[PDB]
Scaffold this motif. Structure first.
Motif, short mmCIF file in Angstrom:
data_model
loop_
_atom_site.label_atom_id
_atom_site.label_comp_id
_atom_site.label_asym_id
_atom_site.label_seq_id
_atom_site.Cartn_x
_atom_site.Cartn_y
_atom_site.Cartn_z
N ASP A 13 -10.61 1.01 -10.69
CA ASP A 13 -9.88 1.61 -9.32
C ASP A 13 -10.65 2.96 -9.30
O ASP A 13 -10.13 3.72 -10.35
CB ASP A 13 -8.63 1.39 -9.57
N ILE A 14 -11.20 3.44 -8.17
CA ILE A 14 -11.89 4.83 -8.33
C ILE A 14 -10.87 5.88 -8.13
O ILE A 14 -11.24 6.78 -8.57
CB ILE A 14 -12.87 4.86 -7.27
N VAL A 15 -9.56 5.70 -7.87
CA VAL A 15 -8.52 6.78 -7.76
C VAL A 15 -8.24 6.84 -9.36
O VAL A 15 -8.25 7.72 -9.71
CB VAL A 15 -7.29 6.18 -7.10
N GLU A 16 -7.97 5.79 -9.90
CA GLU A 16 -7.70 5.79 -11.52
C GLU A 16 -8.65 6.46 -12.22
O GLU A 16 -8.49 7.21 -13.11
CB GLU A 16 -7.04 4.39 -11.75
N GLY A 66 -8.83 1.17 2.59
CA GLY A 66 -9.85 1.14 1.84
C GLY A 66 -9.89 2.28 0.83
O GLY A 66 -8.97 2.95 0.60
N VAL A 67 -11.12 2.65 0.35
CA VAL A 67 -11.35 3.70 -0.72
C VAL A 67 -10.68 4.88 -0.25
O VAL A 67 -9.98 5.73 -0.78
CB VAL A 67 -12.67 3.93 -1.07
N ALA A 110 -6.92 5.21 -0.08
CA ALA A 110 -6.38 5.14 -1.52
C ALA A 110 -6.54 6.67 -2.11
O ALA A 110 -5.57 7.44 -2.78
CB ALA A 110 -7.12 4.20 -2.36
N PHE A 128 -13.60 -1.86 -7.14
CA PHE A 128 -12.25 -2.18 -7.50
C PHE A 128 -11.96 -4.12 -7.99
O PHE A 128 -11.21 -4.16 -8.94
CB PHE A 128 -11.65 -2.02 -6.38
C1 LIG Z 1 -2.08 4.34 -7.22
C2 LIG Z 1 -3.28 3.53 -7.54
C3 LIG Z 1 -4.60 3.83 -6.63
C4 LIG Z 1 -4.27 3.17 -5.53
O1 LIG Z 1 -3.79 3.49 -4.46
N1 LIG Z 1 -4.72 1.73 -5.49
C5 LIG Z 1 -4.86 1.12 -4.30
C6 LIG Z 1 -6.27 0.89 -3.91
N2 LIG Z 1 -7.24 1.37 -4.71
C7 LIG Z 1 -8.52 1.12 -4.14
C8 LIG Z 1 -9.83 1.27 -4.76
C9 LIG Z 1 -10.97 1.01 -3.69
C10 LIG Z 1 -10.58 0.28 -2.31
C11 LIG Z 1 -9.33 0.28 -1.93
C12 LIG Z 1 -8.35 0.41 -2.87
N3 LIG Z 1 -6.71 0.52 -2.80
#
Ligand SMILES: CCCC(=O)NCc1nc2ccccc2[nH]1
Length: 165
Positions: free
Chosen positions: A18-21, A44-45, A48, A152
């Motif tokens: 997960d690019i956010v993590e 999408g990204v 997030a 993801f």
């Molecule tokens: C709190 C954890 C992070 C989060 O908001 N996850 C939901 C999420 N992560 C994605 C990565 C790529 C595309 C769509 C995505 N949706």
């Protein structure tokens, strides 16, 4: 630095993440957002990444659009990375679901060459509607700087690695 990535080429690396993590853990110099021309980070990204910044990315982006107008498809802008990265490179890949020219995907990836190292998603993949296998191919054939791709979806990550030429 970046860990657990599979090396695809001299400069392209990939990981099922997960690019956010990933951004919260690495805090890279540059995280790439899969932006649209209006910088409206709804899903999408982009949705997030924006949600992870507590909407600060969207507030900054709205000020940017009010001053500069929309980006071009294939273009980019550098804004703050907020709590995710030093900078966010907002790159607009063509949205096939909105009938945009897939040939603009190479122009979109060229933006990555202005940064020595980036954490990025596959441009135009996901809700943008392009074939992620094609996006990875364009990435490896266009980007010369060090790009760490976060995919993801595990099933898609496996398909991308197992089909990589
Ligand atoms: C709190 C954890 C992070 C989060 O908001 N996850 C939901 C999420 N992560 C994605 C990565 C790529 C595309 C769509 C995505 N949706």
């Amino acid at each position: 630095s970046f860990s657990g990535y599979l090396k695809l080429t001299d400069n392209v690396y990939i990981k099922n993440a997960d690019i956010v993590e990933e951004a919260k853990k690495v805090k890279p110099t540059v995280v790439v957002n899969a932006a649209n021309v209006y910088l409206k980070h709804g899903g999408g990204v982009a949705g997030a990444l924006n949600k992870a910044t507590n909407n600060a990315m969207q507030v900054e982006s709205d000020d940017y659009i009010a001053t500069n107008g929309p980006l071009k498809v294939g273009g980019s802008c550098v804004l703050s990375g907020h709590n995710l990265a030093k900078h966010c490179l907002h790159v607009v890949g063509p949205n096939v679901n909105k009938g945009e020219d897939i040939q603009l995907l190479k122009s979109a990836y060229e933006n990555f060459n202005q940064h020595e190292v980036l954490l990025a998603p596959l441009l135009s993949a996901g809700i943008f509607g392009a074939d992620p296998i094609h996006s990875l191919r364009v990435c490896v054939d266009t980007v010369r700087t060090n790009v760490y791709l976060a995919v993801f979806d595990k099933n898609l990550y496996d398909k991308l690695v197992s089909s990589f030429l």
